[PDB]
Amino acid sequence: MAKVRIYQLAKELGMETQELLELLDQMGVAYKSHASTLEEKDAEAVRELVKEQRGLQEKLAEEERRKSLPRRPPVVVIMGHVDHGKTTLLDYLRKSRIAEKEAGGITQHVGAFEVKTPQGTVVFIDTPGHEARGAKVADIAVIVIAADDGIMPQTEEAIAHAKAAGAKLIFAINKIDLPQADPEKVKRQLMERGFVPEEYGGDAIVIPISAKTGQGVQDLLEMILLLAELEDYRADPNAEPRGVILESKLDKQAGIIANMLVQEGTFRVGDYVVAGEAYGRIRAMMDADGNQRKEAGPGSAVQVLGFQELPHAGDVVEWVPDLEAAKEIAEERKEERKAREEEEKARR
């Protein structure tokens, strides 16, 4: 130092000889060999210019990986005709989820539950129902058909709903344990309706299963996760929090509560949110496993406390910066709802 030789400075910077010589050439600093001596002006300039380029590349790298978003579990709705085994399938799926013991894990109903597999986690919507807009909830819809019954128009219509809901269809032929079961009949029904099973070279997905047995139900999961990978579901935990109201109700010893599914961003306790005209602050959050949750990320379905009113199902839960923002946004929707219902006076 004062003055330093190039081979010494290179050892300081953990740098290769030719690397530093290349760099010096760029800078316009003349030398002879790496044995040559550097002026302190040049040396300090090198020390600094090395810092820039290094930090910059780490900056370029860090901002490159964040460009790639974390994945999210698939959200799955189960549908079908009455008696076709919908509920039993749902109920079974719960039972397979804790294969261990009580509890622990109060297993409270947050409007959805998660089935964790060695492949990955699947989010199943658990709530009514028959289904009788709103915001997109399920990525995947599972259309259940009894093998001993087959395709009713009810099933046909539950199919067209999921297509209007933008959900990828998965057909499950159920009750295959019955002697009067006819899975082939159902395939022909699906085909004549324009859904061609993969085995026949079409894009339709058909998994035979028994909600009674548990037979092939494992296959159904692997396929969901499979199609999930095909669709590559992902969400940004850092975006402005966005979610959807599954169900909202009243526990008299509690008061207004809401079951919410998180889609984008991360909700936290203390956040102000507005769902439709409903709003409030988040006092607490509780998951399917019962834990009191500080934060909720995409795929998380949680119990929410602190809404002022009961929010409508399927409404979008959206983060807001403060209480005054919640009021104004929620109120503005009320005015239009009110006044446009007086547009519903005449003549409609």
Ligand X SMILES: Nc1nc2c(ncn2[C@@H]2O[C@H](COP(=O)(O)OP(=O)(O)OP(=O)(O)O)[C@@H](O)[C@H]2O)c(=O)[nH]1
Binding site as annotated, residues for GTP: 80-87, 126-130, 174-177
Phi first, then psi, for residue 181 (nearest 5°) are -60, 145
Nearer CB in complex with ligand X: 247/318: 247
Report yes or no: 101 and 39 within 8 Å, Cβ to Cβ: no
Q: How far apart are CA 277 and CA 285, in angstroms?
A: 21
Binding site listing? 80-87, 126-130, 174-177
Nearer CB in complex with ligand X: 118/179: 179
Nearer CB in complex with ligand X: 86/97: 86
Nearer CB in complex with ligand X: 158/278: 158
Nearer CB in complex with ligand X: 109/212: 212
Instruction: Write down the least CB distance from residue 161 to ligand X, Å.
Output: 13
Nearer CB in complex with ligand X: 132/346: 132
Q: Which residues bind ligand X (CB under 6 A)?
A: 80, 82-88, 130, 174-175, 177-178, 210-212
Instruction: Write down the least CB distance from residue 166 to ligand X, Å.
Output: 22
Instruction: Write down the least CB distance from residue 174 to ligand X, Å.
Output: 5
Instruction: Write down the least CB distance from residue 267 to ligand X, Å.
Output: 31
* Structural tokens at position 185: 């009949």
Instruction: Write down the least CB distance from residue 179 to ligand X, Å.
Output: 10
Query: Please, what sign has the CA dihedral across residues 127, 131, 137, 143?
Result: positive
Instruction: Write down the least CB distance from residue 157 to ligand X, Å.
Output: 13
Q: How far apart are CA 155 and CA 59, in angstroms?
A: 53
Nearer CB in complex with ligand X: 84/187: 84
* Structural tokens at position 95: 């039972």
Within its chain, how far is the Cα of 22 from the centroid?
Answer: 49
Nearer CB in complex with ligand X: 129/194: 129
Instruction: Write down the least CB distance from residue 347 to ligand X, Å.
Output: 39
Report yes or no: 125 and 140 within 8 Å, Cβ to Cβ: no
